[PDB]
C-alpha cells in the first residue's frame, strides 16, 4: 500500500481499509457493520487512532523513563 493508496478519490475502499487496519476483534467489525452511518464510523475510528497516539506516547514515556532510571542507577 505504498503507491496504491496515495492520490485516491475512492472513499469506501479507503475507509474500510482503515476498518481492517484497526487491529481488534471480529466482534468490533460486526459492531462496525451494525452502524449504517459513515460519520460515526469515521469519528469513532478517529477516536481509536487518537488512543493509538496515546499508546505511542505512553510507550515513549515508559521507554524514556526506564533508560534514564537505568543509567542513573
Amino acid at each position: 500500500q505504498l503507491e496504491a493508496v496515495k492520490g485516491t478519490s475512492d472513499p469506501a475502499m479507503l475507509a474500510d481499509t482503515i476498518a481492517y487496519h484497526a487491529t481488534w476483534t471480529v466482534a468490533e467489525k460486526q459492531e462496525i457493520l451494525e452502524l449504517t452511518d459513515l460519520e460515526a464510523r469515521l469519528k469513532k475510528v478517529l477516536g481509536l487512532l487518537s488512543r493509538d497516539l496515546e499508546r505511542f506516547e505512553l510507550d515513549k514515556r515508559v521507554a524514556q523513563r526506564v533508560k534514564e532510571q537505568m543509567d542513573t542507577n
Binding site: E39, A40, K43
Partner: protein, 73 residues
C-alpha cells in the same frame, strides 16, 4: 406522486397565514376564512438590524451538527 403501497407524497408551498371561521363535520372536512392576513414591513432600520442578527446567529449555528445530520449549504 402516487405509489401503490399506500403512501402518497405531496410537495406543498405555504402562502400566507389565515384565520379559520368554522369547520364542517365530515369526512371529509371543509373550512372557510373571512379575510387573508397580510402584513407590510414598516420602519425597516431596526428590522434590518434584526435580520442581520438572525443572519449572524444562523451563520454561527450552521457549522455545529457534524454528526447530527445537518447540511452546510
Amino acid at each position: 406522486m402516487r405509489l401503490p403501497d399506500g403512501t402518497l407524497q405531496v410537495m406543498v408551498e405555504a402562502r400566507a397565514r389565515a384565520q379559520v371561521t368554522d369547520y364542517i363535520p365530515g369526512p371529509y372536512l371543509r373550512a372557510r376564512g373571512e379575510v387573508f392576513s397580510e402584513i407590510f414591513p414598516i420602519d425597516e432600520a431596526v428590522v434590518r438590524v434584526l435580520v442581520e442578527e438572525l443572519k449572524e446567529a444562523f451563520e454561527k449555528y450552521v457549522a455545529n451538527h457534524k454528526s447530527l445530520r445537518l447540511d452546510r449549504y
